[PDB]
Amino acid sequence: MTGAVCPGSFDPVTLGHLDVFERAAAQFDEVIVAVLINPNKAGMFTVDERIEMIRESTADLPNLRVESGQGLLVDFVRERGLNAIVKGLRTGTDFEYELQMAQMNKHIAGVDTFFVATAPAYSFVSSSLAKEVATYGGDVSALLPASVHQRLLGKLR
Template identity: 60%
Template sequence: MRRAVCPGSFDPITNGHLDIIARASRLYDEVYVAVMINQSKKGLFEVEERIELIREVTSEFANVRVETHHGLLVDFCKQRDIPAIVKGLRAVSDFDYELQMAQMNNGLTGVETLFVPTNPTYSFLSSSLVKEVAAWGGDVSHLVPPQILDALNRRLRKD
């Protein structure tokens, strides 16, 4: 069985994330969405909320599983026999950072990283940008699934 993981904080998940997950789900038999926990960052959504929202918006993909992990991504991969990490690249600046991570991960355990160019529609998109625009009352409805927009509006009290 071919397995891959799409890691991230997903706070919140965006249409750009979903595009990468959907594309990975067509290439692999099983795709894990690993919601990584960063103790030094306070998220807008609790990890459990993110997992539930991601499960909701990825429910159409029968081969996608959503889990959380605290620690090294390569440990998550080893525990589940996952040989590949799938990452979306928006710009050259992403590549510089992601290449270093890919080389470190490969050096630690042999896990390969596959870079998928982001759909140009989402090349500027990040969770941080979505949160900032939404917090100021901007329209992010075209950047996130409807369930995520509802959750953002509830969290930011903009119903």
């Protein structure tokens, strides 16, 4: 009954995210993708859109499920009877901030954070840079799942 939570805003999910989801699902009995929402700032995609895009690109992972939440990540994790977070690393990750949050999260709730580096091919995509590049016409089709790419272009138009 091992398990981990993969957290993020996933606005939208990228192939970097999906790589890490797949690794987590391969190494833990269950994985929950936590789509964390700031109720004060809307992103590009609604919560239901974000969840749909993740589900469509994770259909081959039988032990992965997707749920939204807000507030403290460690509460989302513990209320599901888990105490592990799996977080991806990419080029441009603020690792010092991630470390700070990992030590705080262990301190307040006993939850462990495991970091895994995304595959090199997917190491320079981020939701924010993908959106920025696509806004001005750049081709990010190879860095996003099919469940995302044309929906992104749709939002931008």
